[PDB]
Amino acid sequence: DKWEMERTDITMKHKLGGGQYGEVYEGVWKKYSLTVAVKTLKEDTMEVEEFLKEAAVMKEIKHPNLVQLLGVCTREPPFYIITEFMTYGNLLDYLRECNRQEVNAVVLLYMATQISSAMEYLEKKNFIHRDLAARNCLVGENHLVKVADFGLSRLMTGDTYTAHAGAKFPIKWTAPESLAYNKFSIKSDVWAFGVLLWEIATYGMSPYPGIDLSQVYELLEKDYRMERPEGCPEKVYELMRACWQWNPSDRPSFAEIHQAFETMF
Ligand SMILES: CCCc1ccc(NC(=O)c2ccccc2NCc2ccc(=O)[nH]c2)cc1C(F)(F)F
């Protein structure tokens, strides 16, 4: 394939995490001695086409801030998708446990710009992530951040519309039109990017502080939004707010969001 490889070139170690379906384990590709991350599905998780669709899309992606595909075991079960191992783990715990003087507002801003560049790229490809949030972002050396997905992906491309059975979307990151009418697009990924910008600014606080899940949409619909986090620059907050525009089409594209970061500065 170019990508095909085989197990027992790989030692499977412990879990790193997973999502509604899919579990990711740390492992070693013995030969080239590299520690790697390998996603698997379960014995009776009948989501083959979904897993295959994730592997297929990943082969089309080449960007410095999108986790790197190394290979795949798709000729026979168990099927594996193998990517590089990101030394610092997920962005959400990184933020919650970090030395803030070292991970300061400027580093938060650079982290945001790197995610925005990954997204603009997905956007050119017409790929929709569908679960963008800090817990799905990963951290390498020297604050390097990359977008990834610990769950069996629910991505959608310009040719696909499927998802694994009972796919549930986290209310606090999911755009209104997506929750209420199941309408997903690049623009819903832009809404999620706004919430992630908010996670980054607050060092990984849980969104919509002081509101029950049951009121989130209703308040959104009445024009309430999360407030500017302490120390978050106004232009960064403005960008969050534009991402949270009610009408999907009034949200900026990822190309505009990246440009705004470039010209802030
Ligand atoms: C539009 C495409 C979106 C997309 C979907 C799926 C993946 N799939 C992974 O992210 C992935 C695949 C296989 C194994 C692990 C893994 N990541 C988790 C991890 C954890 C620790 C660790 O060390 N490494 C990886 C990515 C994307 C992407 F990147 F485009 F956004």
Side-chain angles (χ1 to χ4, degrees), residues 1 3-5 8-14 16-29 32-41 44-48 50-74 77-167 169-229 231-233 236-258 260-265:
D1 187 354
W3 315 92
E4 296 290 346
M5 88 208 14
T8 316
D9 265 85
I10 273 107
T11 308
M12 298 282 303
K13 320 231 182 140
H14 73 293
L16 291 186
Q20 196 158 358
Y21 276 102
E23 16 178 48
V24 177
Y25 291 84
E26 173 180 318
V28 184
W29 194 359
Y32 323 87
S33 300
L34 196 49
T35 285
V36 292
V38 180
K39 191 182 287 191
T40 301
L41 282 184
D44 289 338
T45 277
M46 305 176 297
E47 300 283 356
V48 173
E50 280 307 299
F51 194 87
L52 264 44
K53 168 163 51 72
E54 177 175 336
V57 151
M58 274 170 23
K59 284 172 202 197
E60 289 181 52
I61 293 164
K62 201 188 142 158
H63 186 104
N65 303 283
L66 278 168
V67 76
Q68 200 198 36
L69 180 63
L70 297 191
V72 302
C73 294
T74 72
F79 296 95
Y80 284 156
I81 299 168
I82 303 63
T83 69
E84 65 187 317
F85 171 83
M86 290 290 87
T87 44
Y88 289 81
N90 76 94
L91 179 69
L92 179 69
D93 287 329
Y94 186 77
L95 292 167
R96 295 172 166 167
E97 299 163 1
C98 76
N99 183 149
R100 314 203 190 172
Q101 166 176 356
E102 303 193 349
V103 194
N104 64 37
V106 170
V107 175
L108 300 185
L109 176 84
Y110 178 39
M111 273 176 171
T113 311
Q114 283 166 75
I115 298 163
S116 84
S117 165
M119 298 314 301
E120 157 202 62
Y121 177 79
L122 286 185
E123 183 177 77
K124 283 196 185 175
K125 235 96 134 110
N126 254 293
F127 283 177
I128 306 166
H129 191 286
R130 292 221 293 177
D131 200 16
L132 181 54
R135 59 180 157 78
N136 273 333
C137 292
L138 305 174
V139 187
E141 222 68 51
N142 293 352
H143 325 115
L144 175 50
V145 294
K146 295 202 185 193
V147 178
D149 192 339
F150 277 79
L152 161 60
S153 166
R154 292 95 81 98
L155 63 85
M156 292 179 263
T157 71
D159 291 330
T160 75
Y161 51 77
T162 67
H164 74 251
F169 296 91
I171 292 160
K172 285 161 167 195
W173 287 256
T174 304
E177 78 271 4
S178 308
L179 289 172
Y181 306 97
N182 202 31
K183 183 183 226 218
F184 290 78
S185 52
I186 306 291
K187 296 311 202 204
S188 64
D189 265 3
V190 168
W191 177 291
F193 173 83
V195 178
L196 166 51
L197 257 190
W198 192 101
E199 289 190 83
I200 284 163
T202 55
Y203 290 95
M205 278 184 63
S206 169
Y208 295 97
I211 301 289
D212 289 331
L213 285 183
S214 65
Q215 341 166 53
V216 169
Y217 182 105
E218 137 179 52
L219 289 187
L220 286 180
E221 174 168 47
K222 280 150 112 228
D223 220 23
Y224 283 76
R225 299 285 188 278
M226 277 192 276
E227 279 176 11
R228 193 181 87 177
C232 176
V236 170
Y237 185 57
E238 266 167 30
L239 219 28
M240 269 173 215
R241 288 287 289 275
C243 284
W244 302 334
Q245 273 301 317
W246 188 260
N247 304 330
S249 111
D250 291 348
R251 295 181 197 141
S253 49
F254 278 120
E256 31 204 70
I257 286 151
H258 190 58
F261 275 119
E262 279 181 335
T263 80
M264 221 184 11
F265 306 103

